[PDB]
Amino acid sequence: GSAFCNLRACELSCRSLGLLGKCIGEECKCVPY
């Protein structure tokens, strides 16, 4: 939102599920790890 998505940054947010972070359609997505 307002600026473009980073994936190291998305990975840091998805770490809280134990997931793997990606960006998809300019929003962070966590996939099961």
Write the layout of secondary structure elements.
Layout lengths: L6 H8 L4 E6 L2 E6 L1
Antiparallel strand pairs: 1-2
Descriptive account of the structure:
- It is classed as toxin.
- The entry lists the keywords tamapin, toxin.
- The assembly is monomeric.
- By secondary structure, this protein is α+β, with helices and mostly antiparallel strands.
- 24% of the residues lie in helices and 36% in strands.
- The protein has one helix at residues 7-14; strands at residues 19-24, 27-32.
- It has a two-stranded antiparallel ribbon.
- Strand 1 (19-24) and strand 2 (27-32) form a beta hairpin.
- The longest helix is centred in the first third of the chain and has 8 residues, at 7-14.
- It is elongated and about 30 Å long.
Please indicate the count of domains: 1
Count the E strands.
Answer: 2
Please work out how many helical segments DSSP would assign. 1
> What is the element string, with H for helices and E for strands?
HEE
Straight-line distance between termini: 26 Å
- The percentage helix is 10-25%
Protein name: Potassium channel toxin alpha-KTx 5.4
Region ([R/K]XCQ motif): 8-11
Subcellular location: Secreted
Family: Belongs to the short scorpion toxin superfamily. Potassium channel inhibitor family. Alpha-KTx 05 subfamily.
